[PDB]
Amino acid sequence: AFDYDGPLMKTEVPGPRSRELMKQLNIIQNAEAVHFFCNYEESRGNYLVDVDGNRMLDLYSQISSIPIGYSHPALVKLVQQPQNVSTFINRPALGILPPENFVEKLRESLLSVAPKGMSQLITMACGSCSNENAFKTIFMWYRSKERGESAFSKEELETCMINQAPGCPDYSILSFMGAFHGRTMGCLATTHSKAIHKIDIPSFDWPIAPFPRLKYPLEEFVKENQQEEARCLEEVEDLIVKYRKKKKTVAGIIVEPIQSEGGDNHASDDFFRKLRDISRKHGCAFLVDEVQTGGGSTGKFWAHEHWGLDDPADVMTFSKKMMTGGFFHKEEFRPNAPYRIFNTWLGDPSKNLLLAEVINIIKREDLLSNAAHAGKVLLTGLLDLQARYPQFISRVRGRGTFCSFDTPDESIRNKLISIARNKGVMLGGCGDKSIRFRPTLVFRDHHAHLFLNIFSDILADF
Amino acid sequence: FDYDGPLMKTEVPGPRSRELMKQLNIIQNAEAVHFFCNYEESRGNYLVDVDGNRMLDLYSQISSIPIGYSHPALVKLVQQPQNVSTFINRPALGILPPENFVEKLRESLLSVAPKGMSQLITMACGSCSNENAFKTIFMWYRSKERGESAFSKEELETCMINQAPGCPDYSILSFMGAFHGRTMGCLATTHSKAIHKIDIPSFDWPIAPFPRLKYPLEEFVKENQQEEARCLEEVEDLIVKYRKKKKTVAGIIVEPIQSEGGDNHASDDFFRKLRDISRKHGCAFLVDEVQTGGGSTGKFWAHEHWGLDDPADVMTFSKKMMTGGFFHKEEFRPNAPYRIFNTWLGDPSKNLLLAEVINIIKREDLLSNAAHAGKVLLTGLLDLQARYPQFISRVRGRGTFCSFDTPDESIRNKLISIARNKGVMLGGCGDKSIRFRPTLVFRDHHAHLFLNIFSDILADF
């Protein structure tokens, strides 16, 4: 009801039924990315069931977006309630016609986990439009700094309509190499993960700073890592200055607490505190992307909480585990006029309904601390495996269950993933020679041990 | 299923709505909020607010409610145990689709696919639909230019840092008065109102005139033909000019009926000629049916009115279709995975609802109904236009997709307010025009009800 006791394999993955369904789907669209087809009705807890009857320990959790496992009894109970039916079949335009329980349900969910210093909340449907509207909020804010208390000039008003200055300023958002912030054309400009994401798509001439590449083991590279982070910070400042000279002023800086798709790249809390200070120094809005790191896998609900700041950022975006997307922000960044930050749905109240219960479960079952613990067990296991197989494993790193390690090359990475999948464990890859772990929040230490045993055998027979 | 009339108790917004708006205004700008709603009590064409008011809804959540509120078929859908999973286990559709994914697609979207378009990709809203359509078009164009060869090393290296040749300086041609979304790609092709555009970085992309027809149409045939010809010629000119600026037009995006720009119409001939121009210059033809799609014009997709066997290369949709996404020709199919991709790519629950919505639209013959009720509404509006020329002008529309102009700002706002207090919910476009976006269960007696109420309103104005 809550979970299975272990993985159970029947066929290779993908199996014949999955291959048939993939053959079908491939007619109407490129289906090359598809791993296999799933039986979500029979999936439970940490275990994903496919259409061929295979039951796998899922450590990818739908690209880190399933918060408390599959078919959780609490959510099942939520959908079974008559009074909730409407919420699923009457989707409102939240900007103009919100439901009666909108504010209260927000108090039961998002507002109860608001980041320090951020009294404002705007909901969105995914991380991409979250980051887009964060960008826009920031541009509006910067221009507001520049012109306030003056009003919209007629020239601005008329030129903005035809995509020209001064109506459309030539401002920039600073981003980092290895970043990932979305696929829409605004987000994509700040994304620098893989070429296949970027190529043949028009972009923005915005500044791109290096993200620190830490050396491992960390306790043998203290000075080097310090110097690396310092270098990156100075290059950030220099980029801000350079682009101010270009009359392409940096209005904001966007960054992930942990770069995921770029290859699970970590940096010290000190680094982020200093980056925050730099952002404040040049009057740039500090935007933290917690779309992937948010939801408690790092041991705290938001990853940036590790930095220990009362003033951690100006804007923080979220999605995935949070069911709905959106962003928190300081009151300073509140738009002064309606219909500037706006779209049709602005999320979905049903997702809020699920999220309230998700958060209640996270709090009641103490899942943050559990993430810290289970993640520690997992990391210990990974370090053991690294010691025993230096020909296959290196740079074991992580925080909470947000863990990863590097393999020799991409082919070995994919072989390992494939074999693990056939052995009952679902894995995902970042960078693309790095194996990553994104388990759901009901992932316990014994799941860590299950995985570690299976993968141990795999490595022994590789 | 449906009430048989509006029922007002207070002014709108009433006290409870004002309190809730006060509460919401703490955490965000709530100035846009009309009032708070009781969706549990709403049924069919009638919206119920938190002050007990019941209004005839001719706005339908900005034209996104297909078959009315609390439809019994959808209720039944949510009541089934076997559907529970679908609502609580949201998959990363690009990599791990549910077993019934393809079949549910056959039951829904694939059953109303436009002519010539065998490909389909799902998205969660209109903005990412249009963005990914843009990207699909860019990819297709670069594919034409490099033709069945690998990405060069230079392109692979330059695209990572936002530079040519990896990042081409391609353009999408859009029209003045258009609206295609708020994200920074869509926003560049959007030209409806300045408050949408101001202070946001954009793209130097070609912007063409959209025809402004004169009414009555029967009294301005030649004039309108001249206007349309002018617009087409300016489009071709823009394509050439931007080709010469090394900012090649990879595609043209257009709405069958402009909406946020003030419900701007054009002849079917104009759109056929625009299609031809598109094919002529190697530009992909992208039709935005986010708002026109669903069947309010009397056919499922509005472009169907044009009568073309080859109406477009790509067509985007959302709103009424519960989920968003786009259809396209096989030749626009991405050559490799992970180029058009995101986490969710829509939502299987939306597909679940949509299959039933489409089933109802079919079985209840709601396209024809939209045509008929639309005709009744338009006739009525023409009558009121005749009787109150000092208030109503340029009465126009297709199916229930109708609209008209008022003398100015204030009159439009006042009329909407009075109509709302009288139990009729209306929306405004261009901030001068009143538009109608009724659900598909809007019938001719609802039209009469409205025409009637609004008639007395004009009489007392």
Ligand SMILES: Cc1ncc(COP(=O)(O)O)c(CNC2=C(C(=O)O)C[C@H](C(=O)O)C2)c1O
């Ligand atoms: C930090 C961060 N910021 C923004 C996004 C975009 O979210 P969405 O996919 O638009 O909902 C994401 C989504 N993450 C994705 C992938 C990953 O981390 O592996 C892969 C997916 C993709 O588009 O390829 C999306 C993200 O992780």
Ligand SMILES: Cc1ncc(COP(=O)(O)O)c(CNC2=C(C(=O)O)C[C@H](C(=O)O)C2)c1O
């Ligand atoms: C033709 C067309 N094309 C794209 C979109 C984008 O849709 P979405 O709001 O991002 O789901 C829309 C959404 N419509 C909107 C409004 C309207 O019709 O008046 C108002 C909303 C807004 O952003 O202001 C979006 C549209 O109508």
Ligand code: FES
């Ligand atoms: S852009 Fe966020 S849902 Fe379409």
